Amino acid sequence: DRAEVRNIPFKLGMYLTVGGVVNSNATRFSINVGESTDSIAMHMDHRFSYGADQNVLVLNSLVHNVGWQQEERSKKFPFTKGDHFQTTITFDTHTFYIQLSNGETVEFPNRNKDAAFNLIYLAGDARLTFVRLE
Amino acid sequence: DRAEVRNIPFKLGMYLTVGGVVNSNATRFSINVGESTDSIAMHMDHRFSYGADQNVLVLNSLVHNVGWQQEERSKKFPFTKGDHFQTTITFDTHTFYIQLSNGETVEFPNRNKDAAFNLIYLAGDARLTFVRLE
């Protein structure tokens, strides 16, 4: 199903590194950090072709029984279909700090000021090959 | 619920290190590597007090819609309730190689000669605090 790391708490000052491969012909895939599949504090979507979006990163949060909030977008897109990627995430109570494969970084607000997350999952057209959460 | 790493393939030649804390008053907890909660190729149970078993490691496999097979037991038990533990697991097609916190090792046959596992989970009276699978 989706690739999941569940109930191993991702807490303030810990680092998460995930690695994987993008599918050939991928439309989009996302890395999601939150509390459940309906409650995501950081959704990082990698859009190769989705609607009118082509080669864009879109970040947002999804509030439980409410829905997606305001999208933030990034132009940084060092990703290739069929190829490997590696992303490291850490956060404090105000900001998620994301570092991409090529060293570029993206920052996204920690909108709920949460201090720990119990679900990390990947969805869409990619697969995970390793994970370090420590 | 239980602590889970699902659909990030644990393949031949990869290493899994999990760390956690045993509950005070723990009865037993296990680390399970397999295919599903009913299909476990390596169940490593840490029994502080379970029936007649006190401070023993018990290893076994659970075959889907069939049940547990022959138990193997180990006397090695460097574990304390309330304390931290760290275990590293790797396997080839014949053997699971387990290394405990204090450097002692336990080996258990890879009974089905499987080459990859899609579910790792912890159950019982402990919690996981970090994981590296790479």
Residue by residue, DSSP assigns B31-77 as EEEEEETTEEEEEEEEESSBTTB-SEEEEEEEETTTEE---EEE---
* Residue linked to tokens 């390596």: B42
**Residue A133 CB contacts under 8 Å (≥ 6 apart), including other chains:** A5, A8, A10, A14, A15, A16, A120, B130, B131, B132
Considering only CB atoms, A133 lies closest to which of B1, B6, B131, namely B131
Compute the distance between CA of residue B128 and CA of residue A37 in angstroms, rounded to an integer. Answer: 21
Write the burial class of residue B43 (CB in 10 Å: 0-12 exposed, 13-18 middle, 19+ buried).
buried
Chain A interface mutation, best of B1, B2, B7, B117, highest count of A Cβ atoms under 10 Å: B7
Q: Does B134 contact chain A (CB < 8 Å)?
A: yes
Helix-then-strand count for chain A, H and E:
0, 12
Amino acid identity of B5? V
Candidates B20, B13, B132, B87; CA nearest to A17 is B132
Q: Are A79 and A48 in contact (CB under 8 A)?
A: yes
- Resolution reading in Å: 2.0
Judged by CB atoms closer than 8 Å, whether chains meet at A131 and B132 is answered as yes
Amino acid identity of B108? F
Tell me the chain B residues in contact with residue A6 when contact means C-beta distances shorter than 8 Å: 1, 3-6
Judged by CB atoms closer than 8 Å, whether chains meet at A8 and B7 is answered as no
Candidates A48, A54, A57, A55; CA nearest to A24 is A48
Experimental method: X-ray
Considering only CB atoms, B7 lies closest to which of A1, A14, A133, namely A1
What chain B holds in terms of domains, given with CATH numbers, is 1-134 (2.60.120.200)
Q: Are A82 and A23 in contact (CB under 8 A)?
A: yes
Amino acid identity of B123? A
Compute the distance between CA of residue A72 and CA of residue A59 in angstroms, rounded to an integer. Answer: 5
Q: Are A43 and A61 in contact (CB under 8 A)?
A: yes
Candidates B48, B50, B31, B28; CA nearest to B40 is B31
Write the burial class of residue A26 (CB in 10 Å: 0-12 exposed, 13-18 middle, 19+ buried).
buried
Compute the distance between CA of residue A121 and CA of residue B3 in angstroms, rounded to an integer. Answer: 14
Compute the distance between CA of residue B95 and CA of residue B75 in angstroms, rounded to an integer. Answer: 19
- Other beta carbons within 10 angstroms of residue B28's beta carbon come to 19
- Other beta carbons within 10 angstroms of residue B46's beta carbon come to 24
**Residue B112: DSSP 8-state:** T
**Residue A9 CB contacts under 8 Å (≥ 6 apart), including other chains:** A116, A117, A118, B129
